[PDB]
C-alpha cells in the first residue's frame, strides 16, 4: 500500500538488535564453567 | 513536437542529390571533375536560392560553367540547416573512411 | 581460387585496350607499392585526405582517369587533383620531384608500370576491401 | 638528555615500536595519510571531472549518482596533460576539482609513499638481523601501480591517460587498452597471466601438500589448526611424506624436496612474471604492442582467410571506434 | 556444482578418516 | 580543410571546442583535438606558424609552405605506433607497412634495461648490508635477535 | 581462440562488471600474493646452516627444526603490515583456501552467464542517464565501450546469422 | 592560495630533511651485530 | 540512503582495521 | 616585444594588449578611405549568470560565478571591414578569427553553467557623424550564437542529432513519450547583444582600447533544459587600419 | 600491563533472556504499525 | 530479429532475398537507406491496431 | 535515485545476520572459564 519506506528497516533493527544483545549475553552466561 | 531536423531531411531533396546548400564538399567527389576547384566555390559561394543559382558565381570560366551545366541534374536545394552547416561541418563533419 | 592471368588482365589506356601483367609483376607491384606507397595508402586508403582512394570506380571519376596503366603512370610523374585541375607534384610523390621525395629515384619506367598493374588487380582479388577502411578489416 | 636529536634517531629506528615507523616511513606516513584521506574525500564528494579535455565532466563521486561498483576518482584533465597541477596552481579549488587535480595529488603521493614502504620492507628487515630481499617481491607489485599509474601516462603524454581510481574505471582502463595496443596479443602480458594463474595455482599446491602432510597432534574434535604452537623448535608437517605423495602424482624428479628451492620457486614464479607484466604497460607505453597477425594468412589468390586474430581485430574496432566518442577530430589516433 | 565439492569433501572425509587429525612415522618412500 | 574552403579560426567541433585551434590552459593558441596534450610540442617544421601567443592565424592562413605541408603529411604518416611483429600502425591495422619507430624501440628496450637494474640495485644492496653487518646467508639459530626484543604484542 | 573468447565476454556479457568475477579475480590474484609474499618471507628468514653464500644446500630434507625463523617472521609483518600470521598449520590452509575460493566463485558467475543472466547493468544507472544527458559514470562509458565490440564484432564472430550491418548502421564516436 | 604553496613547501622539507639527515646519523651502525 | 550505506559499511571495515592490528591476541611463544 | 618564450606559461597570451594611460588622443576617418580593422579582442573579465526567480517572479539580478575551466576564455584574431557609413558613422564587421571560446562557470549551488562566449558575425555599430574616434565612441551590435555542443555530438547513452541512437536503447520496453525531450536532439541558434565602449584612442597607430559588455545564452544542451542568461563584462584591443 | 581488578563477570538468566525477547517482540508488535504509518 | 546474445541491436529492414533495403543510421551524413530517403510505411493487420 | 526498496535491508540484514552470529560465538568462547 502507502505505507513508508523504512518502516520495515525501522521494525526489523528495532527487533534484531536489542534481540541479539540479549541473546550475546545469555550465551555467554549459559557457556561459563561452574 | 520535438524532431531530429537532420532525420528530416533525409526525407527531402537532401538525402536524394547533392544539397548546394547543405551537403558536406566531400559528396562532390563523385562527379567528373567537380571536386577539388568547383566544389570549394560552390560551398564557399553561400547558398542559392535554386539550383542554376549555382551557374552564376563569379568568374567561372567558361568551361567550368559547362561541367556544372552538365551535372545540375545531380543537383537540389532546400533551406539551409544549421545542425547541418554549423560547425563549419561543410569541410569536414568528422567523417573518413 | 588461384590468381589466374585472367585476373591479371586490366585496362592499358582509355580506348578499351588490355594489358595482362605477370605473376612477377604483380609481386613486384606489390613489393615497390609496400616501398613507396602503403605508407600513407595502405589498404587503397589516403591516410593524410581520407576523401580520395584508389578505388576503382574513384579513378574512374577522376579528371583525367586514372583507372588504367597509362593514367595511374602519368599520375606517378605529374600527379594533379581530383579535377586535374592543379598540378600538386610538391606535395605528392612524383618523378618530377625525386628530390623531394628519394624513394622516388630509383623507381623507373618499368617499376611505375607494376605498381599501376598492382592498383588495378587488388580490388580484382580483395573487392570493397580495399577501398573502404577499418569498416572492412 | 642523551641529545634529543641522538634520541629522536633512537626512536624513529626503534624495534620496539608496534608498528615500525622507519627512515623510510618518515616520507611514507605522511604521504599516505595525505593520499589516502583526499581519496576518501574525493571518492565520496567530489564533483564531476572534465577528464578529457572537451568540456564533459565525468562524475565518479557516490554522492553525485555512483555506486561502489560504478564510483572512482577521474584522472585530470587532459588539457593539462602531464603539466603539474597542485592546489596552489589552480585560481580556486572549484577549478582544480574540475579539472581533476585530486588524481594527481592521490597518485604522486601514492606512488611515492608506496616506495618507501618498499624501503622500509628492507630497514625492518636490517634491524631485525634478517636477510632482506622480500622488499624486492614487492617490487612487483609496485612496478606495476608505478606502469599503470606514471609510466604509462608520461609515455602516453597525459595524466589522464592513466588508469582511474574506481572500479568500472579500471575496466575502462583495460577495454581500451586492449583497442589501441592489442595487450592480449603480447608476449609480456601472457608471462604476466602465466605468473598469476601459476601463482594461484602453486599456492593451491603448497597450500595442499603440507596442510595434507600434517603430523596428527589434535583429537578427532579439535580443530587440526592447535597441532601448532607459535616458536616451535621441530616442524609441523612431514615434507617427506608431501614430497612422497606429489613425486608420485607426476614422477619423482618433478618434485620438491628441499624447502629451500620450494619456496625460491615459489617466490620467484610470480615475482617474475608479475615484473615482465608491469614491463609490457611500461612498453607499450611508448606504442610497441602485440603482435599484430591481420590478414596474415591470405589464399592462392590474394583473397583473405581470417584466423582467430582477426575475428580479435574487430572486436577490438569496436573498441576503438566507440571510445571517447566525442574527442577525435581527425582520422589518426596519435594519443 | 556446489554440491559436487560437497562429495569430493565428504567421501575423502570418509575414506581418509584414519588420517584426519594428521599422520605420523617412518620414511619408506622408493622401495616397494 | 582550409584549402577548401574552411575558416580554420572559427570551426567549432563536435564538443564546441574548436575543430582545428583551440586554447591551452594558459591562454596560448595551440592545435585542437585529442592533440591538445601536446601543445608543448616545439620542432623546426612546426616554429614558423607560432606567433607570439602561439599559433598565429594569419600565417597559418597563408605562410604555410610546401616542404612544411608534406613534412607533417610525412611524419603523420610515420608516428611510434607498431606491433612487436613490426607492422607499423594502431593495433587493428593491416599488414604491408612495416616499420616501428626507432624511438620506440630504444625507448622500450631501455626502460626495460633501466627497470631491471633498480631491482639489480635494490638486490645487491640488500645483500652489502647483511653481508657488512653479516647476516646474509640466515639467522644464528644459537642468537636469534627477535628473541631478545620484548613482546610487541 | 581465447582472448576473443575474453573480448566477448566484456562486449556481450559485460563480466567484468560481475560480483562472482571479481571475486574470482581477488582470488587468482590474491593468491599469487600469498604465494611471492610467503615465498620471500621464507627465503630472508632464515638460520644459517651452512658456511656458504648459496644457502640452499644447507636444507635438513630430513625434518628437525624448522628452517626459517617463524618467530622472526611474525614480528617483521607484524611491524610492518600491522598484522601477520603465527600458526604455519592455519597460514598453509589460508593458501588452499584464497584461490580454490576465487575460482569456485567465478565459476558460478559463469554458470550463470549461461541462461545469459548476467551482471550487465545497474538500473538507476540507465534510468538517470536516459532523462539527463549531462549524467557520465566510468559505467556508461564502458557499456557505449560494449555496443561497439558487439556491433563491430557479431558479423564475422557469428556467421550462422548471415548479418548485414550497413555502414551507416555501425555505432561510431567522431573522426574514428 | 600562495600561502597553501609556500605552507607545502615548507612540510615537504621538514620531512625530506628528517629523511636525509636521518640515514646519514650511521644507520649502518643500526642492527644486530657487526656494526 | 545508498551513499550512507557504502560509506557506514566502510566505516566499518577501517574499524575493523583498528581493533585487528591494535587489539589481537598478543602472540604468544612456545608455551600453549 | 616578447618572443612566444617569453610569454608560455605566463598566462600572458590569454591577455588582449593594453594602451598607455597616455594614448587618450582621437583617430581620424577619411570617410573617403576604405578601413578595416586589423585585429579586435576581446578579454573577459566577469561573467555574470542572470538567476531564475523560482516560480514567485520577483525579478532577477545577475550574479558573480567562479571560472571553473581556466584562462581559455579570450577572443583574439578577429578581422573585418570597419566600413564608413553615408550618415557618418561606422559599422565593424567580422570575417573571421578565433571568434568564439567554450566558457564554464561554476555558481552558489555547484552548478556549472557552460556557454559559448562568442561574438560570430558582429555587427557593431557607432554614433552618426563621428569624424575621429575619441575616447568611449561607443560600438554597439548584434553577433550569433550557435549551440554549444555541434551536430555529432554524443551523450552519454549514445544518442545524437546528426549521429547516434535514436532512443534509450538501455530501456528497450519503456513508454517512450517522457523521454521524448532527451532522445530528439535540437541545435539551438540564437543572437546576442555586445557593445564595446572606447576609453583610450591613439590615433598615431591607430589603435583604439577599451571595456565591452555582451549578453547572451549559455549551453541548453542539445535542448535538454534551457539556456540561463549570460552577461559577460571584460576589455578590448583594436587595430584600426587603412587597409 | 596489569590485570585490571575492576572487572567482575556479566550475567543473563535464561529467564531474563525470554522477559527481554518478549518485550522486544511485543514493542516491535506495537509501534511496526506506525513506523510504516 | 534481435538475438538473444544481444542487449541492444540495430533496425535493419530488409527484402525476401535478404538484400538491405531500409534502416535507421547512426551518423546520417552519408545515409542511403534512412526510412526517410526511402519512404518506409508500416501496415497492421489483426490485433489492436488492425487495418 | 531510481534504487531498489529492499536493497537497504537487503545490506542490512547481510552484514548484520552473519556478524551477529560470530559475535554470540566468540564471546561465548571468550567467557568461557579457563
Ligand atoms: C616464472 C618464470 C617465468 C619465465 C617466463 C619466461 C618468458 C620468456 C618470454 C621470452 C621471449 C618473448 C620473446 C618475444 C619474441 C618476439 C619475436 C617476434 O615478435 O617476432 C615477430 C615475428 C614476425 O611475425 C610475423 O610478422 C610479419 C610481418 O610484419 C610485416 O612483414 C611483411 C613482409 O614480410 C610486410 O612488410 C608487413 O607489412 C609488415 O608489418 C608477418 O605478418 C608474419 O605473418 C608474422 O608471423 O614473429 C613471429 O612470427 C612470431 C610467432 C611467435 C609465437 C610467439 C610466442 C611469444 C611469447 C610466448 C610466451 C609463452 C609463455 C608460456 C608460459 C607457459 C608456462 C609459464
Ligand atoms: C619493457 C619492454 C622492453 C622491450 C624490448 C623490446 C625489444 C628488444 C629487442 C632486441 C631485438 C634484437 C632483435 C633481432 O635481432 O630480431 C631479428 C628478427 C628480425 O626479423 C626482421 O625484422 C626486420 C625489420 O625491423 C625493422 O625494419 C623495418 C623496415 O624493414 C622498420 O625500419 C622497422 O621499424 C624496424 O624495426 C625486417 O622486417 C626483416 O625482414 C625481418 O626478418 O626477429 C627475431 O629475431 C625474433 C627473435 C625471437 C626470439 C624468441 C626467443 C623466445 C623464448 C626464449 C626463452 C629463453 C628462456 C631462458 C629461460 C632460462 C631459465 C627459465
Ligand atoms: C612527509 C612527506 C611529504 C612529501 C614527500 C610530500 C610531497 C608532495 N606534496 Mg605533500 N603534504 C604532506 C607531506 C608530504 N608531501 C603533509 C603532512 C600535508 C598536509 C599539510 C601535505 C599536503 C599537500 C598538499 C595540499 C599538496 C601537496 C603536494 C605535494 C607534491 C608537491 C610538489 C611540490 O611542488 O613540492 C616539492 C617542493 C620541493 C621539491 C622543494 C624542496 C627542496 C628541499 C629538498 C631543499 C630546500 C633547500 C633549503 C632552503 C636548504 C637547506 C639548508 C640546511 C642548512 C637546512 C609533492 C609530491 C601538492 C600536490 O599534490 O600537487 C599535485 C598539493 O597540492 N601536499
Ligand atoms: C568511501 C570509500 C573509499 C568506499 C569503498 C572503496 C573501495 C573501492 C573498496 C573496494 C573493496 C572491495 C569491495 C573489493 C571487492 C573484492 C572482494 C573483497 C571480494 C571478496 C570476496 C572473495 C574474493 C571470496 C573468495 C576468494 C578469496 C578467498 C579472496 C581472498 C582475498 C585475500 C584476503 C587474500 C590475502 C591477501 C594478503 C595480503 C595475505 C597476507 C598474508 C600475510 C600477512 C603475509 C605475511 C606473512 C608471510 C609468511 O610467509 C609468514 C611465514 C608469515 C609469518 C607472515 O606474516
Ligand atoms: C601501515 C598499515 C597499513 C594497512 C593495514 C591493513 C590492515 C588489515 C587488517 C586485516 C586483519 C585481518 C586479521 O586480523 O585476520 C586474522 C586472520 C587469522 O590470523 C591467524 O589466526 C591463526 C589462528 O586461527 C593464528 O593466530 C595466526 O597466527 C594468525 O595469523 O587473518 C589472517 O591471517 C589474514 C591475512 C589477511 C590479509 C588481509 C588483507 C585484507 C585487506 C582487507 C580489507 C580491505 C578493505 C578496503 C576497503 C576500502
Ligand atoms: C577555494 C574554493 C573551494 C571551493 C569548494 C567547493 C566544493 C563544492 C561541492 C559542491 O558544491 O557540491 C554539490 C554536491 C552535490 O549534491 C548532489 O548534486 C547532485 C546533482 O549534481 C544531485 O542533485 C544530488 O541529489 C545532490 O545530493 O555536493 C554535496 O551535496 C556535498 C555534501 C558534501 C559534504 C562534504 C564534506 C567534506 C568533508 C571533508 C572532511 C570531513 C571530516
Ligand atoms: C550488539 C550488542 C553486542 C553486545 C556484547 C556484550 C559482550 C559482553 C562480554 C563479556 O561480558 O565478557 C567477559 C569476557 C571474559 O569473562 C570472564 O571469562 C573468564 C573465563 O575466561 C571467566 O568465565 C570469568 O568469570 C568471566 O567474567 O570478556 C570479554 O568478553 C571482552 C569482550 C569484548 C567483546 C567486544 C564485542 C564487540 C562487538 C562489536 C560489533 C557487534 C555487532
Ligand atoms: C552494535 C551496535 C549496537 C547499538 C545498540 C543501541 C541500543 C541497544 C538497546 C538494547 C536494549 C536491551 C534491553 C534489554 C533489557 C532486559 O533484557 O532486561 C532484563 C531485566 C532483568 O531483570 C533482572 O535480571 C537479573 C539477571 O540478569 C536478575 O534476575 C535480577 O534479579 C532481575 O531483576 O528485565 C526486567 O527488568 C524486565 C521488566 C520486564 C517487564 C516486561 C513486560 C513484558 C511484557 C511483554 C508482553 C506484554 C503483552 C501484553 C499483551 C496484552
Ligand atoms: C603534519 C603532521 C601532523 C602530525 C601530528 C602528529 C604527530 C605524531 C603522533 C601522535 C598522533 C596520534 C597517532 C596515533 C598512533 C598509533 O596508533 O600507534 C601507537 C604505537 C605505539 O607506540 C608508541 O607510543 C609510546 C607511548 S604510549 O603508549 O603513548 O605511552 C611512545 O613513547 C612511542 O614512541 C610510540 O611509538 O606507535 C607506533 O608503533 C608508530 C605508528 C605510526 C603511525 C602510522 C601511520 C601509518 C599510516 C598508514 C596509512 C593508513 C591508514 C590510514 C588511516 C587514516
Ligand atoms: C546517515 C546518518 C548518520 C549515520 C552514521 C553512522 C551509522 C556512522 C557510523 C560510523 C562508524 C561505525 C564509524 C567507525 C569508525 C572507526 C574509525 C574511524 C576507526 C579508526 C581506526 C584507526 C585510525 C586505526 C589505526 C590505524 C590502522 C588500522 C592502520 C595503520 C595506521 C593506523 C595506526 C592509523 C548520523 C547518525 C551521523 C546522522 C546523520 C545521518
Ligand atoms: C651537493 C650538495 C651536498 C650537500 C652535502 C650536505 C651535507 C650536510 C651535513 C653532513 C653532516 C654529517 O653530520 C654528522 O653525521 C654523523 C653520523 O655520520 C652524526 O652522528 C649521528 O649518528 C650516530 C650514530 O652513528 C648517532 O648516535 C648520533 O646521535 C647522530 O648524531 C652527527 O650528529 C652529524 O652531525
Ligand atoms: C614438497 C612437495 N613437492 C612440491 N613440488 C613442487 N613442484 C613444482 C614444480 C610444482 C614447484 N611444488 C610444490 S608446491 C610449491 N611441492
Ligand atoms: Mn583516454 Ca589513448 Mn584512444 Mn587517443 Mn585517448
Ligand atoms: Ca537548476
Ligand atoms: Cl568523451
Ligand atoms: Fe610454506
Redesign the interface.
Known amino acids: 500500500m502507502e505505507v513508508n519506506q523504512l518502516g520495515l528497516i525501522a521494525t526489523a533493527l528495532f527487533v534484531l538488535v536489542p534481540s541479539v544483545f540479549l541473546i550475546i549475553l545469555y550465551v555467554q552466561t549459559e557457556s561459563q564453567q561452574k | 513536437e520535438l524532431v531530429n531536423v537532420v532525420d528530416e531531411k533525409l526525407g527531402t531533396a537532401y538525402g536524394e542529390k547533392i544539397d548546394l546548400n547543405n551537403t558536406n564538399?566531400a559528396a562532390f567527389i563523385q562527379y567528373r571533375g567537380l571536386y577539388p576547384t568547383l566544389?570549394?566555390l560552390i560551398?564557399?559561394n553561400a547558398p542559392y536560392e535554386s539550383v542554376e543559382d549555382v551557374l552564376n558565381i563569379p568568374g567561372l570560366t567558361e568551361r567550368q560553367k559547362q561541367i556544372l551545366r552538365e551535372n545540375l541534374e545531380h543537383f537540389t536545394v532546400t533551406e539551409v540547416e544549421t545542425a547541418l552547416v554549423?560547425?563549419?561541418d561543410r569541410?569536414?563533419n568528422?567523417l573518413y573512411k | 581460387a588461384e590468381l589466374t592471368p585472367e585476373v591479371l588482365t586490366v585496362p592499358l589506356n582509355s580506348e578499351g585496350k588490355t594489358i595482362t601483367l605477370t605473376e612477377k609483376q604483380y609481386l613486384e607491384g606489390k613489393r615497390l607499392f609496400?616501398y613507396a606507397c602503403?605508407?600513407?595508402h595502405?589498404?587503397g586508403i589516403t591516410?593524410?585526405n581520407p576523401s580520395l582512394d584508389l578505388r576503382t570506380e574513384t579513378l574512374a571519376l577522376a579528371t583525367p582517369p586514372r583507372d588504367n596503366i597509362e593514367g595511374l603512370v602519368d599520375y606517378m610523374k605529374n600527379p594533379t587533383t581530383y579535377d586535374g585541375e592543379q598540378e600538386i607534384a610538391?606535395?605528392h610523390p612524383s618523378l618530377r620531384s625525386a628530390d623531394?621525395?628519394p624513394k622516388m629515384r630509383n623507381l623507373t619506367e618499368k617499376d611505375l608500370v607494376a605498381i599501376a598493374g598492382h592498383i588495378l588487380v587488388e580490388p580484382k582479388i580483395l573487392g570493397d576491401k580495399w577501398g573502404g577502411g577499418?569498416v572492412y578489416? | 638528555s642523551a641529545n634529543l636529536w641522538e634520541r629522536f634517531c633512537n626512536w624513529v629506528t626503534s624495534?620496539?615500536?608496534?608498528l615500525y615507523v622507519g627512515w623510510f616511513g618518515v616520507i611514507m606516513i605522511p604521504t599516505l595519510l595525505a593520499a589516502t584521506i583526499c581519496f576518501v574525500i574525493a571518492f565520496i564528494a567530489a564533483p564531476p571531472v572534465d577528464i578529457?579535455?572537451?568540456?564533459?565532466p565525468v562524475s565518479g563521486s557516490l554522492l553525485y549518482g555512483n555506486n561502489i561498483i560504478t564510483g572512482a576518482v577521474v584522472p585530470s584533465s587532459?588539457?593539462?596533460?602531464?603539466?603539474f597541477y597542485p592546489i596552489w596552481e589552480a585560481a580556486s579549488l572549484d577549478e582544480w576539482l574540475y579539472?581533476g587535480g585530486p588524481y594527481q595529488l592521490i597518485i604522486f603521493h601514492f606512488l611515492l609513499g608506496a616506495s618507501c614502504y618498499?624501503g622500509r620492507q628492507?630497514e625492518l628487515?636490517?634491524r631485525?638481523?634478517?636477510?632482506?630481499?622480500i622488499?624486492?617481491a614487492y617490487?612487483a607489485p609496485l612496478?606495476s601501480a608505478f606502469a599503470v599509474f606514471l609510466?604509462y601516462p608520461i609515455?602516453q603524454?597525459?595524466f589522464?591517460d592513466g588508469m582511474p581510481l574506481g572500479i568500472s574505471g579500471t575496466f575502462n582502463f583495460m577495454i581500451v587498452f586492449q583497442?589501441?595496443?592489442?595487450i592480449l596479443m603480447?608476449?609480456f602480458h601472457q608471462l604476466g597471466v602465466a605468473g598469476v594463474f601459476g601463482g594461484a595455482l602453486f599456492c593451491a599446491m603448497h597450500g595442499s601438500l603440507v596442510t595434507s602432510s600434517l603430523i596428527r597432534e589434535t583429537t578427532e574434535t579439535e580443530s587440526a589448526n592447535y597441532g601448532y604452537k607459535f616458536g616451535q623448535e621441530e616442524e609441523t608437517y612431514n615434507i617427506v611424506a608431501a614430497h612422497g605423495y606429489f613425486g608420485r602424482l607426476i614422477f619423482q624428479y618433478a618434485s620438491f624436496n628441499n624447502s629451500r628451492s620450494l619456496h625460491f620457486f615459489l617466490a620467484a614464479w610470480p615475482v617474475v612474471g608479475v615484473?615482465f607484466t608491469?614491463?609490457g604497460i611500461?612498453?607499450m607505453?611508448?606504442?610497441?604492442?602485440?603482435?599484430?597477425?591481420?590478414?596474415?594468412v591470405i589464399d592462392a589468390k590474394g583473397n583473405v582467410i581470417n584466423t582467430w586474430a582477426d575475428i580479435i581485430?574487430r572486436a577490438?574496432?569496436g573498441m576503438?571506434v566507440m571510445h571517447?566518442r566525442?574527442?577525435?577530430?581527425?582520422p589518426?589516433?596519435?594519443? | 556444482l556446489l554440491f559436487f565439492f560437497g562429495h569430493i569433501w565428504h567421501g575423502a572425509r570418509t575414506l581418509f578418516r584414519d588420517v584426519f587429525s594428521g599422520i605420523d612415522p617412518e620414511l619408506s618412500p622408493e622401495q616397494v | 580543410?582550409q584549402?577548401?574552403?574552411?575558416?580554420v579560426?572559427?570551426?567549432?567541433?563536435?564538443?564546441?571546442?574548436?575543430?582545428?585551434?583551440?586554447?591551452?590552459?594558459?591562454?596560448?593558441?595551440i592545435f585542437?583535438?585529442?592533440?591538445?596534450?601536446?601543445?608543448?610540442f616545439r620542432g623546426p617544421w612546426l616554429e614558423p606558424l607560432?606567433?607570439?601567443?602561439?599559433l598565429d592565424?594569419?600565417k597559418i592562413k597563408n605562410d604555410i609552405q610546401?616542404?612544411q605541408?608534406?613534412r607533417a603529411?610525412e611524419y603523420?604518416?610515420?608516428?611510434?605506433?607498431?606491433?612487436?611483429?613490426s607492422?607499423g600502425?594502431?593495433?587493428?591495422?593491416?599488414?604491408?607497412?612495416?616499420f616501428?619507430?626507432p624511438?620506440?624501440?630504444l625507448?622500450?628496450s631501455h626502460?626495460?634495461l633501466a627497470?631491471?637494474f633498480?631491482?639489480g640495485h635494490?638486490?645487491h644492496?640488500?645483500?652489502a648490508?647483511?653481508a657488512?653487518?653479516?647476516?646474509?646467508?640466515?639467522?644464528?639459530?644459537e642468537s636469534?635477535?627477535?628473541?631478545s626484543?620484548?613482546?610487541?604484542? | 581462440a581465447i582472448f576473443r573468447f575474453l573480448l566477448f565476454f566484456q562486449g556481450f556479457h559485460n563480466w567484468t562488471l560481475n560480483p562472482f568475477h571479481m571475486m574470482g579475480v581477488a582470488g587468482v590474484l590474491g593468491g599469487a600474493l600469498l604465494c611471492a609474499i610467503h615465498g620471500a618471507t621464507v627465503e630472508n628468514?632464515?638460520?644459517?646452516?651452512?658456511?656458504?653464500?648459496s644457502?640452499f644446500r644447507?636444507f635438513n630434507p630430513t625434518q628437525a627444526?624448522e628452517t626459517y625463523?617463524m618467530?622472526?617472521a611474525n614480528?617483521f609483518w607484524?611491524?610492518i603490515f600491522g598484522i601477520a600470521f603465527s600458526n604455519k598449520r592455519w597460514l598453509h590452509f589460508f593458501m588452499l583456501f584464497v584461490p580454490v575460493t576465487g575460482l569456485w566463485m567465478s565459476a558460478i558467475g559463469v554458470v550463470g552467464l549461461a541462461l545469459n543472466l548476467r551482471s550487465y547493468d545497474f538500473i538507476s544507472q540507465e534510468i538517470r542517464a536516459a532523462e539527463d544527458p549531462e549524467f557520465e559514470t566510468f559505467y556508461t562509458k564502458n557499456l557505449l565501450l560494449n555496443e561497439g565490440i558487439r556491433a563491430w564484432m557479431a558479423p564475422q564472430d557469428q556467421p550462422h546469422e548471415n548479418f548485414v550491418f550497413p555502414e551507416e548502421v555501425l555505432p561510431r564516436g567522431?573522426?574514428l | 592560495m600562495e600561502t597553501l604553496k609556500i605552507t607545502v613547501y615548507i612540510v615537504v622539507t621538514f620531512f625530506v630533511l628528517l629523511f636525509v639527515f636521518g640515514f646519514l646519523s650511521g644507520d649502518?651502525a643500526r642492527?644486530?651485530?657487526?656494526? | 540512503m545508498e551513499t550512507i550505506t557504502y560509506v557506514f559499511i566502510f566505516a566499518c571495515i577501517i574499524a575493523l582495521f583498528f581493533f585487528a592490528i591494535f587489539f589481537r591476541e598478543?602472540?604468544?611463544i612456545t608455551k600453549k | 616585444?616578447?618572443?612566444?618564450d617569453?610569454?608560455?606559461?605566463?598566462?600572458?597570451?590569454?591577455?588582449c594588449p593594453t594602451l598607455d594611460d597616455t594614448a587618450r588622443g582621437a583617430y581620424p576617418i577619411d570617410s573617403s578611405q576604405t578601413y578595416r580593422i586589423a585585429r579586435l579582442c576581446l578579454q573577459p573579465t566577469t561573467f555574470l549568470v542572470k538567476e531564475e526567480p523560482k516560480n514567485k517572479r520577483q525579478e532577477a539580478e545577475f550574479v558573480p560565478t567562479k571560472l571553473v575551466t581556466?584562462?581559455?576564455?579570450?577572443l583574439?584574431?578577429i578581422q573585418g571591414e570597419l566600413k564608413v557609413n553615408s550618415d557618418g558613422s561606422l559599422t565593424f564587421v567580422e570575417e573571421?578569427?578565433?571568434?568564439?571560446?567554450?566558457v564554464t562557470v561554476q555558481m552558489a549551488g555547484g552548478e556549472r553553467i557552460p556557454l559559448?562566449f562568442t561574438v560570430?558575425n558582429l555587427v557593431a555599430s557607432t554614433q552618426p557623424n563621428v569624424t575621429s574616434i575619441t575616447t568611449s565612441t561607443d560600438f554597439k551590435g548584434e553577433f550569433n550564437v550557435?549551440?554549444?555542443?555541434?551536430?555529432?555530438?554524443?551523450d552519454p547513452k549514445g544518442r545524437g542529432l546528426a549521429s547516434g541512437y535514436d532512443s534509450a536503447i538501455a530501456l528497450p520496453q519503456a513508454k517512450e513519450e517522457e523521454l521524448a525531450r532527451a532522445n530528439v536532439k535540437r541545435f539551438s541558434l540564437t543572437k546576442g547583444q555586445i557593445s564595446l565602449n572606447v576609453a583610450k584612442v591613439d590615433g598615431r597607430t591607430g589603435e583604439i582600447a577599451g571595456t565591452f559588455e555582451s549578453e547572451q545564452l549559455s549551453?541548453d544542451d542539445m535542448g535538454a533544459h534551457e539556456p540561463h542568461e549570460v552577461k559577460i563584462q571584460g576589455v578590448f584591443y583594436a587595430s584600426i587600419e587603412p587597409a | 600491563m596489569e590485570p585490571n581488578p575492576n572487572r567482575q563477570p556479566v550475567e543473563l538468566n535464561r529467564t531474563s533472556l525470554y522477559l527481554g525477547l518478549l518485550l522486544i517482540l511485543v514493542l516491535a508488535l506495537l509501534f511496526s504499525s506506525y513506523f510504516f504509518n | 530479429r534481435m538475438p538473444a546474445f544481444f542487449e541492444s541491436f540495430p533496425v535493419i529492414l530488409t527484402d525476401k532475398n535478404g538484400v538491405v533495403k531500409a534502416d535507421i543510421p547512426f551518423r546520417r551524413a552519408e545515409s542511403k537507406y534512412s526510412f526517410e530517403q526511402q519512404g518506409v510505411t508500416v501496415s497492421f493487420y489483426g490485433g489492436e491496431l488492425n487495418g
Chains 1, 13 share one sequence.
Open positions: 564538399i566544389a570549394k560551398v564557399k554549423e560547425g563549419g569541410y569536414n568528422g | 609496400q602503403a605508407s600513407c595502405v589498404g591516410k593524410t610538391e606535395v623531394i621525395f577499418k578489416y | 624495534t620496539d615500536n608496534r578529457d579535455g572537451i568540456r564533459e587532459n588539457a593539462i596533460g602531464l603539466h579539472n618498499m628492507w628487515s636490517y631485525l638481523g634478517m636477510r632482506p630481499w622488499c624486492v617490487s612496478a609510466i609515455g603524454g597525459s589522464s583497442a589501441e595496443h592489442n603480447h608476449p615484473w608491469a614491463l611500461s612498453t607505453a611508448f606504442n610497441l604492442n602485440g603482435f599484430n597477425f591481420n590478414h596474415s581485430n577490438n574496432l576503438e571517447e566525442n574527442a577525435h577530430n581527425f589518426l589516433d596519435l594519443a | 580543410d584549402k577548401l574552403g574552411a575558416n579560426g572559427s570551426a567549432q567541433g563536435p564538443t564546441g571546442l574548436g575543430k582545428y585551434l583551440m586554447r591551452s590552459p594558459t591562454g596560448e593558441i585542437g583535438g585529442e592533440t591538445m596534450r601536446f601543445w608543448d607560432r606567433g607570439p601567443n602561439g592565424l594569419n610546401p616542404w605541408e608534406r603529411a603523420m604518416t610515420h608516428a611510434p605506433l607498431g606491433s612487436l611483429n607492422v600502425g594502431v593495433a587493428t591495422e593491416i599488414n604491408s607497412v612495416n616501428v619507430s624511438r620506440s624501440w625507448a622500450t626502460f626495460v627497470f631491471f633498480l631491482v635494490l638486490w644492496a640488500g645483500r648490508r647483511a657488512a653487518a653479516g647476516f646474509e646467508k640466515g639467522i644464528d639459530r636469534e635477535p627477535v628473541l626484543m620484548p613482546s610487541l604484542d | 628468514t632464515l638460520f644459517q646452516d651452512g658456511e656458504g653464500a644457502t644447507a627444526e625463523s618467530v622472526t614480528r607484524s611491524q567522431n573522426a | 649502518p642492527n644486530p651485530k657487526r656494526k | 598478543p602472540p604468544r | 616585444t616578447l618572443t612566444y617569453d610569454i608560455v606559461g605566463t598566462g600572458l597570451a590569454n591577455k581556466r584562462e581559455t576564455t579570450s583574439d584574431q573571421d578569427g578565433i571568434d568564439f571560446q567554450p559559448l560570430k550557435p549551440s554549444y555542443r555541434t551536430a555529432n555530438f554524443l549551453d
